[PDB]
Task: structure prediction
Amino acid sequence: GVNLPARRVIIRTPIFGGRPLDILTYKQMVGRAGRKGVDTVGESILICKNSEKSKGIALLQGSLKPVRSCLQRREGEEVTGSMIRAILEIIVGGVASTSQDMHTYAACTFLAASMKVQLGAIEACVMWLLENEFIQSTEAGKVYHPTHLGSATLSSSLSPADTLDIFADLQRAMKGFVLENDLHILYLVTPMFEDWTTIDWYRFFCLWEKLPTSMKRVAELVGVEEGFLARCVKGKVVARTERQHRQMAIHKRFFTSLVLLDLISEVPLREINQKYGCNRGQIQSLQQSAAVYAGMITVFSNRLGWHNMELLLSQFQKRLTFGIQRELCDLVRVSLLNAQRARVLYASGFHTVADLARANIVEVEVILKNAVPNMRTIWVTGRKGLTEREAAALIVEEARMILQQDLV
Amino acid sequence: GVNLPARRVIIRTPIFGGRPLDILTYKQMVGRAGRKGVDTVGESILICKNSEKSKGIALLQGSLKPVRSCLQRREGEEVTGSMIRAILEIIVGGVASTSQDMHTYAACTFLAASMKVQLGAIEACVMWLLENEFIQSTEAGKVYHPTHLGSATLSSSLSPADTLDIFADLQRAMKGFVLENDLHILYLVTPMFEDWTTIDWYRFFCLWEKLPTSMKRVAELVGVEEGFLARCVKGKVVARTERQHRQMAIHKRFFTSLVLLDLISEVPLREINQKYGCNRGQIQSLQQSAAVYAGMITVFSNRLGWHNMELLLSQFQKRLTFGIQRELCDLVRVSLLNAQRARVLYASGFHTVADLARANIVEVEVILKNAVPNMRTIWVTGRKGLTEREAAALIVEEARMILQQDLV
Result:
């Protein structure tokens, strides 16, 4: 993640996560030994048990694997999502219009450069995009053009195998959308689960009893079922079939949307932790991936022309990223303001960036000095810590500059 | 309406609409005789049959009735909508806090000045509000405060008696809103019928067959009934009871929303006339009253805090006023552009007002000169007719001024 120099790098065991340590990770770990321009030498100690020792020596003497890219379809695969995405991007973008061009493109891949089957993989990917009509075939050979369902995947950056599920889910929402709360909007922008946390199903079912009626109404629409939650409480649930994989994913996705609903209502991370069991960094790493996904789904609906969906969803990318009520969404345009600092300026009465740009800097200082509880009390992710006087002056001047940029 | 002077005002019959002419109307008619500074005398001829001569004399010699206002509750009335609004509008505004103030306010009323029963009429209106939680009561006498439902009825200028149906309809929509098209929104912003036209029920039922499935899914939600339309086709239908009055109103309101949906999608008035039977001026007078009502429902939902409703509804006031697609809503900010002129500039490629301010005036001239089909070809409601060269120059300079005003 970050370059930190250290003199002594200790690795407590050659085994990580129940696996032997990856040589790439080990060389990244050990490569941080030695404080540049301060140490005479760097030191690393792999602490190793007598039973581990053969693995430990393998880490010291081993060297990185050659690169081999995902465009190789494995045994029993006729297509790969990276290749499908590749063929989509060139057809829908229009830079490869014909099968003669698609072979000419594929010869530029690192797969071709590594081989220097692929001519079959191209055709199999074309066939998948065609049968679902991400692309359409016209007679010249064949000339392939996108549909609206194709062009939307390229603009959204959504994976097209997921796009069939996203597309049908959004249509089924529009057939009957619960505007009564933001939970139905949230559910559609929740990511696929990807094990962002270990769900405590006995907590989740005991929340489901308390869950507001207008949120259980969403749950029945999206497909949650309280008998299956009780079956998760009763014991281990396993999915053998793609039907069962989809059935289970809905409940994990709904639990995620409840965490986000607390997150976009400024519920403190300590209270979310106590209520759902999540760690702070799990909630924040969920928050980033949901905010990214909320962007994709907006552009996807806009390209299709679901104008009433893009109105609702567009607010949520910013609103998820900071995790704020609807009113703070203006203030946060000042990058010095997080949800905490925006709420204290909003609480005082600086409801909008234009009013904040008018503000007397001494008043912003006194608001921050009082509301937050020298010594660089405030942290700004692009800076070292700031004093109240310095942060307030930079806030006002940044708000004015935003007006200057917005008017220009 | 607009003052037109004429030398002879001829009135073809003393009977209008099957009724004797109103003396206020007759004196408004005859008062237009005589072209100021041109005629020596004005003339009016009431043409009258031998059977009507007694009515003719009654109009000719009659004089206007004394004015008498609606705050007099009739026999069998506990309260009047005007008095309920009056008593609300002072309580929710805080200008009359207690019953001592409400009797003091009533003494300022033209009702009191005309009488110079009402002290009971105030209490009956207070009681109707209180029981519905438009307002709430506290121990001092009593001190009355508005609820959110009362403050919404004030701010939106809606009537209090209709608000209970608007409120419960909007709630029932939010329990399950069809975003699949703009019709479910249009059903909520369309006014009550008020005899804006006479429905051709055999025509309407033949449309109800063709009606798109996503527009019949709305219809089942709002409460339209395929059997009741057939019952209107079968023969005359009447309502003896309020439960029957609203049942008929739902179908009249749905028919109105279909006319608006065609208008909202720029279907020409001649094609709407052929399709629905409306006159041009019936659509345009519906259009203006639907654009007023769309504003009220936005403010009502905003005050209650139905933020997801106010997002959807707010666009429709401008769309209804002009009868435009979503993309023209920016261009239309130029008051010289109607839906027709906005469509020809949007077709040429001036999608947004900033590009219209950049446009070369000679290019806008050539676009108007070509796209519309000297002699003041173009009509501007605030002006006499304009030449292509003059209208185009005024459009570009108005677009620039709109930027100057928006930046300032």
Notes: Chain A touches chain B through 21 residues (CB under 8 Å). Strands of chain A lie at 8-11, 15-16, 19-20, 43-46, 135-139, 142-146. DSSP finds 21 helices and six strands in chain A.
